Coordinates of C-alpha atoms (C1' of nucleotides) in Angstrom, one line a residue:
Chain A
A1 CA 0.0 0.0 0.0
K2 CA 0.9 3.7 -0.3
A3 CA 3.5 5.6 1.8
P4 CA 3.8 9.4 2.6
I5 CA 6.6 10.1 0.1
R6 CA 7.9 13.6 -1.0
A7 CA 7.1 15.1 -4.5
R8 CA 9.6 14.2 -7.5
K9 CA 11.1 17.1 -9.4
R10 CA 14.3 15.8 -11.0
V11 CA 16.1 17.0 -14.2
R12 CA 18.8 15.1 -16.2
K13 CA 18.9 17.2 -19.5
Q14 CA 15.3 17.5 -20.6
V15 CA 16.2 17.3 -24.4
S16 CA 12.5 16.9 -25.7
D17 CA 13.8 15.6 -29.0
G18 CA 16.4 13.1 -30.4
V19 CA 18.0 10.8 -33.0
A20 CA 18.1 7.1 -32.8
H21 CA 20.8 4.8 -34.5
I22 CA 20.2 1.2 -35.6
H23 CA 23.4 -0.9 -36.3
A24 CA 22.0 -4.3 -37.9
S25 CA 24.7 -7.1 -38.4
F26 CA 24.3 -10.8 -39.3
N27 CA 24.3 -12.2 -35.7
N28 CA 22.6 -9.4 -33.6
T29 CA 21.0 -5.9 -33.7
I30 CA 22.3 -3.0 -31.5
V31 CA 19.6 -0.3 -30.9
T32 CA 20.8 3.2 -29.4
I33 CA 18.9 6.5 -28.4
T34 CA 20.9 9.8 -28.5
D35 CA 20.3 13.6 -28.3
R36 CA 20.2 15.3 -31.7
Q37 CA 23.5 17.2 -31.0
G38 CA 24.9 13.7 -30.2
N39 CA 25.1 12.1 -26.8
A40 CA 23.8 8.6 -25.7
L41 CA 20.6 8.6 -23.5
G42 CA 20.5 4.7 -23.5
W43 CA 20.8 1.6 -25.5
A44 CA 19.4 -2.1 -25.5
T45 CA 20.0 -5.3 -27.5
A46 CA 18.5 -8.5 -28.9
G47 CA 21.3 -10.7 -27.6
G48 CA 20.5 -9.3 -24.1
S49 CA 16.9 -10.5 -24.6
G50 CA 18.6 -14.0 -24.6
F51 CA 17.1 -15.6 -27.9
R52 CA 20.6 -17.0 -28.9
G53 CA 21.3 -19.2 -32.0
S54 CA 19.7 -18.0 -35.4
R55 CA 16.7 -16.7 -33.4
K56 CA 19.0 -13.9 -32.1
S57 CA 19.0 -12.3 -35.6
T58 CA 15.3 -11.8 -36.3
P59 CA 12.8 -8.9 -36.8
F60 CA 11.0 -9.8 -33.5
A61 CA 14.1 -10.0 -31.2
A62 CA 15.2 -6.8 -32.8
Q63 CA 11.7 -5.1 -32.2
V64 CA 11.8 -6.0 -28.4
Chain B
rC1 C1' 51.9 -8.8 -112.2
rU2 C1' 48.4 -8.7 -107.9
rU3 C1' 45.8 -12.3 -106.4
rG4 C1' 49.6 -13.1 -101.0
rA5 C1' 51.8 -9.7 -97.8
rG6 C1' 54.1 -4.9 -96.3
rU7 C1' 53.7 1.0 -95.3
rC8 C1' 52.5 6.8 -94.9
rU9 C1' 49.2 10.6 -92.6
rC10 C1' 43.8 10.4 -90.7
rG11 C1' 39.5 8.8 -87.9
rU12 C1' 37.4 5.1 -84.2
rA13 C1' 36.6 1.5 -79.9
rG14 C1' 38.7 -0.6 -75.6
rA15 C1' 39.8 -2.8 -68.0
rG16 C1' 46.9 -4.0 -73.2
rG17 C1' 51.6 -2.5 -70.9
rG18 C1' 55.3 1.0 -67.6
rG19 C1' 56.1 5.5 -63.8
rG20 C1' 53.6 9.9 -61.7
rG21 C1' 49.3 12.4 -59.2
rU22 C1' 44.4 12.0 -56.0
rA23 C1' 39.4 11.6 -52.7
rG24 C1' 35.9 9.8 -49.5
rA25 C1' 33.5 5.7 -46.6
rA26 C1' 32.5 1.1 -43.1
rU27 C1' 36.0 -2.3 -40.1
rU28 C1' 40.3 -0.5 -37.3
rC29 C1' 42.6 3.0 -33.9
rC30 C1' 43.2 7.6 -30.6
rA31 C1' 41.5 11.8 -28.2
rG32 C1' 37.7 14.3 -25.8
rG33 C1' 31.9 14.2 -25.0
rU34 C1' 27.7 11.2 -23.9
rG35 C1' 26.4 6.5 -21.7
rU36 C1' 25.7 1.0 -19.1
rA37 C1' 26.7 -4.7 -19.5
rG38 C1' 27.3 -7.6 -22.4
rC39 C1' 29.9 -7.8 -27.1
rG40 C1' 31.2 -12.1 -30.4
rG41 C1' 30.0 -16.7 -32.5
rU42 C1' 26.7 -20.8 -34.2
rG43 C1' 23.7 -26.1 -36.4
rA44 C1' 23.5 -25.4 -30.9
rA45 C1' 27.8 -24.1 -28.5
rA46 C1' 32.1 -22.6 -25.8
rU47 C1' 37.3 -20.4 -26.3
rG48 C1' 38.3 -14.7 -27.3
rC49 C1' 37.4 -9.5 -25.8
rG50 C1' 35.2 -6.3 -21.7
rU51 C1' 33.6 -2.8 -16.0
rA52 C1' 41.0 -0.1 -16.1
rG53 C1' 33.9 1.2 -18.6
rA54 C1' 33.5 -2.7 -23.3
rG55 C1' 29.9 -2.9 -27.4
rA56 C1' 27.6 1.2 -30.0
rU57 C1' 27.2 6.7 -30.7
rC58 C1' 28.6 12.5 -31.5
rU59 C1' 32.8 15.5 -33.0
rG60 C1' 37.5 15.8 -34.9
rG61 C1' 42.2 13.5 -36.2
rA62 C1' 45.0 8.9 -37.6
rG63 C1' 46.4 5.1 -40.9
rG64 C1' 46.8 1.0 -45.1
rA65 C1' 44.8 -2.3 -49.0
rA66 C1' 40.7 -1.5 -51.7
rU67 C1' 37.3 1.4 -55.1
rA68 C1' 31.6 -2.2 -55.1
rC69 C1' 27.4 -0.1 -58.8
rC70 C1' 28.4 2.2 -64.1
rG71 C1' 30.1 -3.8 -65.3
rG72 C1' 26.6 -5.4 -70.6
rU73 C1' 25.3 -11.9 -74.5
rG74 C1' 30.3 -5.2 -74.1
rG75 C1' 35.5 -4.3 -75.2
rC76 C1' 40.8 -5.3 -74.8
rG77 C1' 45.9 -8.2 -74.3
rA78 C1' 50.2 -12.9 -77.3
rA79 C1' 47.8 -17.6 -74.4
rG80 C1' 46.9 -17.7 -69.2
rG81 C1' 46.2 -12.4 -68.9

RNA sequence: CUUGAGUCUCGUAGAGGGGGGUAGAAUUCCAGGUGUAGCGGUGAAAUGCGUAGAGAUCUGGAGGAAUACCGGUGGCGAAGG
């Protein structure tokens, strides 16, 4: 159940808009969000979703 | 003699040969900036590499082969070339 917590107010860089980069290879996909002026705000992968084998290089493991 | 072959200047098509000059782009690398955990490999897998901060990504520099497409049943070289 609910607790009496203070209000949240935090800032990081508030960029509002970005560019994304997709590096597709033969064994994996690497998917990366950045700011438009060019700084990484996070990434994920298809290999870290743990499909492994051929199943690791598919449109669906890449989507997730 | 020309009926074999040879030769002059002219045009034409082409990756024939030797030496010069030249650019950008991924891997790769370095530096700074941003940023967190896999990256790689495969039939499935593990060795490698990585928190000293990798992988990727922004900016800028580095370096060496190579130069795809146009390249086509094309064209060229003495044959491979």
